[PDB]
């Protein structure tokens, strides 16, 4: 019944983009529809299945925000709390005056899209933000960027004084039933984890970087996506991951037609092709945008990259619906969408 038309938007995406493999999943109502196609690692010749590890880049950030959000329902923090609060490092700096909620949101004041090549180890990371000047006011512009999102879900782990790996593996991904979700992948589960492929064609997979747990670092499966995503929609049994998650859906400011989550972006459902394109684009991603305030249905979504990977993931939860695209290689973000909204307006 599903099959055809995940089938008709993926296929041709395969070819085109020469994709070796991508697992597909979707919610429809409570059923959970599993569609995987190609080849994991062209090396060994594994197959792609419901349970192949892919890493998926920024959709980690939603995760991170989850677990900020579990930080702030268990008292431990407030969004509106300055940084420096939670790191005693960082008093007598701009994040004197900079929120946790900021960080979060990526509307701090210009932090870049990602760290400076030379911030390898936990020492130069300090010292960057303390010599890091402000280019905008607090909350003023949406600047995308790994160091911001990544500082929140560092100092949010802080306060709950746990490091952030173990926290996220042993707290929050199980408490999610994400039993097959890692920040690092054990050995037992090394012969799931796909390879990706780059523009070159060669396997490559992700490498470590400062705080790449908390921004882009998780490793997961179609399968265990999509119970995420239906935790997002009919979500969990315990009432304070249930209120994190919660957290997560409300809107704190809009650009154009894309309105900013923790983690999480929002439209107003059903949704234009263009609308989803515009808010989704290199201008979005890449520059820096003044915010505007948050939109008055609702489409979430997140995309997510590493060099040899691309996920994409959309949900609504007012129909029941949503969809997980895991592939092992980095393909054009305006192909995720415009497959992952077809394949919505059909199951719609």
Same mark, same amino acid.
């Given at each position: 019944?599903?099959?055809?038309?995940?089938?008709?938007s993926i296929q041709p995406l395969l070819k085109e983009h020469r994709i070796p493999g991508m697992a597909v999943a979707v919610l429809k109502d409570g059923k959970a529809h599993y569609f995987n196609y190609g080849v994991a690692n062209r090396e060994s010749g594994a197959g792609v299945s419901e349970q192949t590890?892919?890493?998926? %880049? &920024?959709?980690?950030?939603?995760?991170?925000?989850?677990?900020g959000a579990y930080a702030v329902v268990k008292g431990a923090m407030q969004l509106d709390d300055k940084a420096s609060r939670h790191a005693p490092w960082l008093k007598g700096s701009a994040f004197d005056s900079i929120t946790m909620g900021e960080l979060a949101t990526y509307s701090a004041g210009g932090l870049p899209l990602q760290f400076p090549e030379e911030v390898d180890s936990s020492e130069k990371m300090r010292a960057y933000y303390r010599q890091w000047a402000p280019?905008?006011?607090? %909350? &003023?512009?949406?600047?995308?960027?790994?160091?911001?999102?990544?500082l929140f879900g560092h100092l949010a782990a802080?306060?709950?004084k746990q490091p952030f790996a173990p926290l996220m593996e042993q707290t929050l991904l199980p408490g999610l039933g994400m039993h097959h979700t890692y920040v690092n992948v054990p050995k037992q589960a090394m012969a799931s984890y796909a390879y990706g492929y780059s523009k070159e064609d060669k396997?490559?997979?992700?490498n470590p970087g400062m705080l790449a747990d908390e921004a882009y670092g998780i490793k997961t499966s179609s399968a265990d996506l999509l119970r995420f995503v239906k935790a997002n929609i009919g979500g969990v049994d315990d009432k304070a991951l249930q209120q994190a998650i919660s957290l997560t859906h409300q809107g704190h400011y809009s650009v154009g037609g894309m309105t900013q989550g923790l983690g999480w972006e929002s439209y107003a459902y059903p949704v234009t092709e263009q609308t989803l394109l515009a808010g989704n684009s290199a201008k979005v991603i890449l520059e820096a945008n003044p915010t505007a305030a948050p939109r008055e249905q609702v489409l979430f979504n997140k995309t997510g990259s590493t060099n040899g990977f691309g996920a994409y993931v959309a949900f609504v939860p007012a129909r029941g619906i949503g969809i997980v695209m895991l592939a092992n290689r980095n393909y054009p973000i305006e192909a995720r969408i415009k497959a992952a909204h077809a394949i919505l307006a059909q199951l719609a």
């Open positions: 019944p599903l099959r055809p038309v995940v089938d008709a590890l892919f890493e998926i %880049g &920024s959709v980690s950030k939603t995760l991170t925000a989850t677990l280019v905008y006011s607090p %909350g &003023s512009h949406r600047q995308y960027s790994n160091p911001s999102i990544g802080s306060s709950l396997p490559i997979r992700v």
